[PDB]
Write a protein that binds this ligand. Structure first.
Ligand SMILES: Cc1ccc(S(=O)(=O)N2CCSC[C@H]2C(=O)N[C@@H](CC(C)C)C(=O)O)cc1
Length: 107
């Protein structure tokens, strides 16, 4: 599944509604802690509609629990990410992923 641990608390009241656009900055790391991709490296946040399956299950459930301004660590089992296949060229097969995600705004 996906486990969430807060790095910096959010407002504790503004949570995403289903289908709402979540604007985030994230850094994804493999289990050895090495970054494989980060929106911060592009200086542009990443956006997705909660529950529209634009992101892995780990994010769909992990970000659902977060509030605006919160920055948290999401640890995601492979089956909640890319499973046995992984994603060629960046994420190996059977990879547990750890993301540092900051929910910046809800539109
Ligand atoms: C090629 C690539 C680059 C970054 C990542 S990630 O940071 O893990 N990454 C993008 C940040 S959202 C969390 C996850 C994801 O859900 N990606 C989307 C679109 C991606 C694939 C464009 C998907 O799996 O459909 C996965 C795969």
């Amino acid at each position: 599944g996906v486990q969430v641990e807060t790095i910096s608390p959010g407002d504790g009241r503004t949570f995403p509604k289903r289908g709402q656009t979540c604007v985030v900055h994230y850094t994804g790391m493999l289990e050895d802690g090495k970054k494989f991709d980060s929106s911060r490296d592009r200086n542009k946040p990443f956006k997705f509609m909660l529950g529209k399956q634009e992101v892995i299950r780990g994010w769909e459930e992990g970000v659902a629990q977060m509030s605006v301004g919160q920055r948290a660590k999401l640890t995601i089992s492979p089956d909640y990410a890319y499973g046995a296949t992984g994603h060629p060229g960046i994420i190996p097969p059977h990879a547990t992923l750890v993301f540092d995600v900051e929910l910046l705004k809800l539109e």
